[PDB]
């Protein structure tokens, strides 16, 4: 079998969107509040707030996402941003260091902090396990990008209204991912199944982080270290 032009054009714009919204130089991290080793929360909040802007930039370039109602776009971003951040962070996760390494040695986040960022190992332990399993999948650049787009266009998220239209977009992306692996990935006989199981892991990681984020935002001494965008996206306000 063979991929079509519509499916390869979806891949092209999707890979392009990721290259615009992900900076492998990590040079913008010097503009965040520095990390201190909840001393890591100021740097961690700036890091997440920055990444949320990338996810919004990546989302706006996914085919069909821009044509959804603004309410659907907000509901999708509010519930999937945390998962897409976890998904994209795999690009900096190192199996050798068991940590996220972003350019310099001051932007290397590795476990022991964890308690200095305001989170507990009930989120870190499953997340690191998630990150190493995703890293072992050796995803192609095309596959990593499709998984982020499939994750964002999930209709089963609280808030979405036009469920049918969003589902049709997601299935088109899933057929592309299935057709890409069969035709372009050698040994990808069961990769599509393992990739979809990662989405199920994300919902569990989403739930755990949201539980722990509630404890932060309920203490004003900690939530004042967050950014307005983080408070808007990870908030509970409803459109």
């Amino acid at each position: 079998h063979m991929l079509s032009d519509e499916q390869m054009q979806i891949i092209n714009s999707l890979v392009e969107a990721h290259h615009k919204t992900y900076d492998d130089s990590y040079s913008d991290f010097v503009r965040f509040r520095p990390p201190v080793r909840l001393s890591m929360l100021p740097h961690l909040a700036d890091l997440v707030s920055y990444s949320i802007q990338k996810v919004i930039g990546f989302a706006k370039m996914i085919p069909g996402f821009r044509d959804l109602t603004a309410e659907d776009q907000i509901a999708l971003l509010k519930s999937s941003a945390i998962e897409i951040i976890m998904l994209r962070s795999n690009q900096s996760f190192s199996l050798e260091d068991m940590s996220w390494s972003c350019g310099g040695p001051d932007f290397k986040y590795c476990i022991n902090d964890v308690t200095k960022a305001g989170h507990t190992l009930e989120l870190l332990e499953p997340l690191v396990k998630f990150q190493v399993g995703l890293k072992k999948l050796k995803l192609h650049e095309e596959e990593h990008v499709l998984l982020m787009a499939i994750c964002l266009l999930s209709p089963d998220r609280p808030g979405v209204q036009d469920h049918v239209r969003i589902e049709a977009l997601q299935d088109r992306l899933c057929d592309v991912l299935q057709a890409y692996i069969r035709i372009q990935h050698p040994g990808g006989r069961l990769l599509y199944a393992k990739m979809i199981q990662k989405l199920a892991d994300l919902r569990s990681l989403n739930e755990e982080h949201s539980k722990q984020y509630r404890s932060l935002s309920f203490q004003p001494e900690h939530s004042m270290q967050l950014t307005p965008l983080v408070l808007e996206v990870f908030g509970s306000e409803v459109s």
Binding site: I74, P228, E237, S239
Partner: peptide, 10 residues
């Protein structure tokens, strides 16, 4: 409402 989200989405 979602002031920053609306702006960021143009």
């Amino acid at each position: 409402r979602h002031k920053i989200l609306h702006r960021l989405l143009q």
